Amino acid sequence: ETCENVDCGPGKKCRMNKKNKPRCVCAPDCSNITWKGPVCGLDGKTYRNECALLKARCKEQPELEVQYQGKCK
Numbered sequence: 001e002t003c004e005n006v007d008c009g010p011g012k013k014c015r016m017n018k019k020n021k022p023r024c025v026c027a028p029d030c031s032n033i034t035w036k037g038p039v040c041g042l043d044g045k046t047y048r049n050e051c052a053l054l055k056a057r058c059k060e061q062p063e064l065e066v067q068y069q070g071k072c073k
Contacts, residue, residue, distance in 0.1 A: 011058050026058035040072035041065070 008024035
């Protein structure tokens with residue numbers, strides 16, 4: 001099977017993995033994000049940029065959001 005006709009839904013795209021299988025992977029479009037610096041997540045961790053936060057939200061933490069811009073305290 002290939003990535004053709006696969007619909008991965010919001011924030012994800014199809015990529016062929018190292019076992020030759022099509023997979024849907026977290027891939028937020030960073031170009032949609034207006035703030036370009038680090039952010040402080042609702043988990044209390046700093047993310048190098050907001051796109052990295054959104055990738056983490058997609059992969060592991062569905063409730064993760066930016067609680068303030070810049071680095072966390």
